[PDB]
């Protein structure tokens, strides 16, 4: 609930780098098109223009005094791995050895290419090693996909139709457990240790499952949401065992309503105690209503804060936890020290399609704009 | 040397001014100018003032080294259009720094002293409020991030009610992080007939390209 002026945190901007030509039209679908290997020091960015793999070094350039901060660096050396269809989702395994690319294709449907990251290490084929075909409809659109934080071979995939599958990849893709579209899953997140899986549902609950998909716990749809105004879970981040960031948005799927970011703290001795739900409302100010709602959440443990970014907003805001470690504040930063996405040549807002944090160089936040520009920032706490 | 008129649109008055009296200001306002020790207009003010006070109003891009001259010029423009009767921002001024903002603020306060009901808000780092409350002040000054915040994130300011918009030291402005895009996003918010006024000591390609995005149909003037 509470804002507080932080004069001790800067997002210090680095040179923007163009990675793709500007689209003819604003992308509207839920996407996650940016990935970082902090192990091998790589950035992976995808789109309709194929898949690009950069050495993270090449993308992190600081502007010197005299440098027009608004200048966009022309292009940077990387590998181009041509893709038949537009990628909407990229994600790594936890051991950084497997990259998954979700493509949507009018003839085949939606399908996941799995790559052995080590292949990108060679000169001139660079084929994936498995393909998985999720769907033949716009229903097969992948809305959420995360790999297990402690189990390299395992990943949860979440479709537009509201169905989920847990997969194991080794020599091939093995489908371990699915749940049908009637379940209406809208989002997924692994527990910190990867022992359970959290799924956000169309009915605004979050259900904790074991990877086998045996139901362990249900997190109620907060009591302050009137039936009159139903919410679905949009995005969820399982931060600590009993601590969640659950984003809620209009159930009907309306875009006009801006979704709320909520820190949920769960009881241990449940019967009887209630859960604390602390609303942040819109921490990333919504300026667009064209794009599908999506909140990119990231937890920084070291600083005990979340970085939030919204599909509908040009700003990255911070939700930090107070020293009591029960409450959170939003921070307000000096105008010269914010991470906000640039305005396009056409005078338009550019919005995020991917967010990631590199440690291999300060930590660095990186955003990929709807304009195909990459915006990196040092973080100084 | 004189001012250089580099682009002058029609319906924009063609006369230089040699006295603040021939500007036909309100008495309260003229006394204000006089009280600061401005007994006659400066070189820049000779042309900038007629352009800015013309009816109906005209947007201006103005090259001049910053100084009391140019500032008082745009401060007067702002005060001219204010209606202390209506208790809400009507004039918005963007400074590149907190320090410049306070400094220009003084100038407003000084020049508006004989305005009894007129009050000035600072959209800067430090000043806080709750989200419920619209502010009462009729002129607002600050740095673009916080001004942007105010206008659209915190609902402090209804941008659709601002009739004069100053963008000061635009060179210094877009040299600092995020300010360029903040300014653009604020101006976007303002109504069609709001008066756009930009000032910069220097005009390099970037700055000039910027200025044109921000200020439609401008008068362009440069001193010396």
UniProtKB/Swiss-Prot annotation, chain A:
Repeat positions for Blade: 33-85, 86-140, 141-183, 184-229, 230-293, 294-349, 350-380
Places the protein is found: Nucleus, Nuclear pore complex
Annotated stretches, region: Seven-bladed beta propeller: 33-380
Positions bearing Phosphoserine: 22
Post-translational modification: Probably glycosylated as it reacts with wheat germ agglutinin (WGA).
Highest taxon, organism lineage: Eukaryota
Tissue: Expressed in thymus, spleen, bone marrow, kidney, brain and testis, but hardly in all other tissues or in whole embryos during development.
Effect of residue 343 to A: Reduced binding to DDX19B
Assembly and binders: Homodimer. Part of the nuclear pore complex (NPC). Interacts with NUP88. Interacts with ZFP36; this interaction increases upon lipopolysaccharide (LPS) stimulation. Interacts with DDX19. Interacts with XPO1. Interacts with XPO5.
Associated clinical condition: A chromosomal aberration involving NUP214 is found in a subset of acute myeloid leukemia (AML); also known as acute non-lymphocytic leukemia. Translocation t(6;9)(p23;q34) with DEK. It results in the formation of a DEK-CAN fusion gene.
Domain notes from UniProt: Contains FG repeats. FG repeats are interaction sites for karyopherins (importins, exportins) and form probably an affinity gradient, guiding the transport proteins unidirectionally with their cargo through the NPC. FG repeat regions are highly flexible and lack ordered secondary structure. The overall conservation of FG repeats regarding exact sequence, spacing, and repeat unit length is limited. The beta-propeller contains long interblade connector loops, and mediates interaction with DDX19B.
Known function: Part of the nuclear pore complex. Has a critical role in nucleocytoplasmic transport. May serve as a docking site in the receptor-mediated import of substrates across the nuclear pore complex.
UniProt name for this protein: Nuclear pore complex protein Nup214
Organism annotation: Homo sapiens (Human)
Shown part of the complete sequence: 9 to 405 of 2090
From Swiss-Prot, chain B:
Result of changing residue 185 to D: Impairs interaction with NUP214
Impact upon substituting residue 188 to A: Impairs interaction with NUP214
Renumbered ranges of motif DEAD box: 168-171
Positions of ATP binding: 45, 64-71
Chain ranges of the Helicase ATP-binding domain: 51-221
Motif extent (Q motif): 18-46
Subcellular location: Cytoplasm; Nucleus, Nucleoplasm
Region feature N-terminal lobe, mapped onto this chain: 1-224
Domain characteristics, as noted in the entry: The N-terminal extension helix acts as an autoinhibitory domain, preventing ATP hydrolysis, unless the N-terminus of the protein is displaced by RNA binding, allowing cleft closure to bring key side chains into position for catalysis.
Assembly, per entry: Associates with the nuclear pore complex via interaction with NUP214. Interacts with NUP214 or RNA in a mutually exclusive manner.
Family under the similarity heading: Belongs to the DEAD box helicase family. DDX19/DBP5 subfamily.
Function statement: ATP-dependent RNA helicase involved in mRNA export from the nucleus. Rather than unwinding RNA duplexes, DDX19B functions as a remodeler of ribonucleoprotein particles, whereby proteins bound to nuclear mRNA are dissociated and replaced by cytoplasmic mRNA binding proteins.
Name of the protein: ATP-dependent RNA helicase DDX19B
Gene source species: Homo sapiens
Lineage: Eukaryota, Metazoa, Chordata, Craniata, Vertebrata
Residues of the full protein shown: 75 to 298 of 479
């Amino acid at each position: 609930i509470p804002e507080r002026e932080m004069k001790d945190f800067q997002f210090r901007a680095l040179k923007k780098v163009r990675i793709f030509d500007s689209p003819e039209e604003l992308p509207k679908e839920r996407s996650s098109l940016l990935a970082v290997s902090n192990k091998y020091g790589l950035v992976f960015a995808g789109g309709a223009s194929g898949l690009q793999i950069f050495p993270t070094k090449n993308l992190l350039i600081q502007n010197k005094p005299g440098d027009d901060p608004n200048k966009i660096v022309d292009k940077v050396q990387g590998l181009l791995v041509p893709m038949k269809f537009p990628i909407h989702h990229l994600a790594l395994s936890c051991d950084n050895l497997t990259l998954s690319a979700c493509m949507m294709s009018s003839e085949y449907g939606s399908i996941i290419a799995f790559f052995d990251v080590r292949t990108f290490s060679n000169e001139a084929q660079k084929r994936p090693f498995a393909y998985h075909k999720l769907l033949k409809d716009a229903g097969g659109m992948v809305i959420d996909m995360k790999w297990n934080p402690t189990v390299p071979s395992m990943v949860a995939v979440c479709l537009a139709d509201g169905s989920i599958a847990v997969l194991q990849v080794t020599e091939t893709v093995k489908v371990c457990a699915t749940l049908p579209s009637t379940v209406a899953v809208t989002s997924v997140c692994w527990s910190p240790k990867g022992k359970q899986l959290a799924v956000g549902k169309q009915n605004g609950t979050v259900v904790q499952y074991l990877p086998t998909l045996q139901e362990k716990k249900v997190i109620p749809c907060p009591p302050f949401y009137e039936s009159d105004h139903p919410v679905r879970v949009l995005d969820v981040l399982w931060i600590g065992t009993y601590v969640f960031a659950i984003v809620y948005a209009a159930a009907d799927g309306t875009l006009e309503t801006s979704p709320d970011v909520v820190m949920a703290l769960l009881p241990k001795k449940e019967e009887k105690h209630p859960e604390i739900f602390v609303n942040f409302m819109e921490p990333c100010y919504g300026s667009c209503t064209e794009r599908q709602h999506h909140y990119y959440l990231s937890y920084i443990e070291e600083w005990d804060l979340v970085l939030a970014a919204s599909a509908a907003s040009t700003e990255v805001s911070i939700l930090a936890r107070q020293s009591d470690q029960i409450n959170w504040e939003s921070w307000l930063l000096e105008d010269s020290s914010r991470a906000e996405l640039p305005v396009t040549d056409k005078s338009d807002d550019s919005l995020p399609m991917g967010v990631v944090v590199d440690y291999t160089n300060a930590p660095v936040l990186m955003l990929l704009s709807t304009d195909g520009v990459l915006c990196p920032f040092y973080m100084i706490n | 040397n004189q001012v250089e008129v580099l682009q002058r649109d029609p319906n924009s008055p063609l006369y230089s001014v040699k006295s603040f009296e021939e500007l036909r200001l309100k008495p309260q306002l003229l006394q204000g100018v006089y009280a600061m020790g401005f007994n006659r207009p400066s070189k820049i003010q000779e042309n900038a003032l007629p352009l800015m006070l013309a009816e109906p109003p005209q947007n201006l891009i103005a090259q001049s080294q910053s100084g009391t001259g140019k500032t008082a010029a745009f401060v007067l423009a702002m005060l001219s259009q204010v209606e202390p009767a209506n208790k809400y921002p009507q004039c918005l001024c963007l400074s590149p720094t907190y320090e410049l903002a306070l400094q220009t603020g003084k100038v407003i306060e000084q020049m508006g002293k004989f305005y009894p009901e007129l009050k000035l808000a600072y959209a800067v780092r430090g000043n806080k409020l709750e989200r419920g409350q619209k502010i009462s002040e009729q002129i607002v000054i600050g740095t673009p991030g916080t001004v942007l915040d105010w206008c659209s994130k915190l609902k402090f300011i209804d941008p659709k009610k601002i009739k004069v918009f100053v963008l000061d030291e635009a060179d210094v402005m877009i040299a600092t992080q995020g300010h360029q895009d903040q300014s653009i996003r604020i101006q976007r918010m303002l109504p069609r007939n709001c008066q756009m006024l930009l000032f910069s000591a220097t005009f390099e390609d970037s700055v000039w390209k910027f200025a044109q995005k921000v200020v439609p149909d401008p008068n362009v003037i440069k001193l010396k």
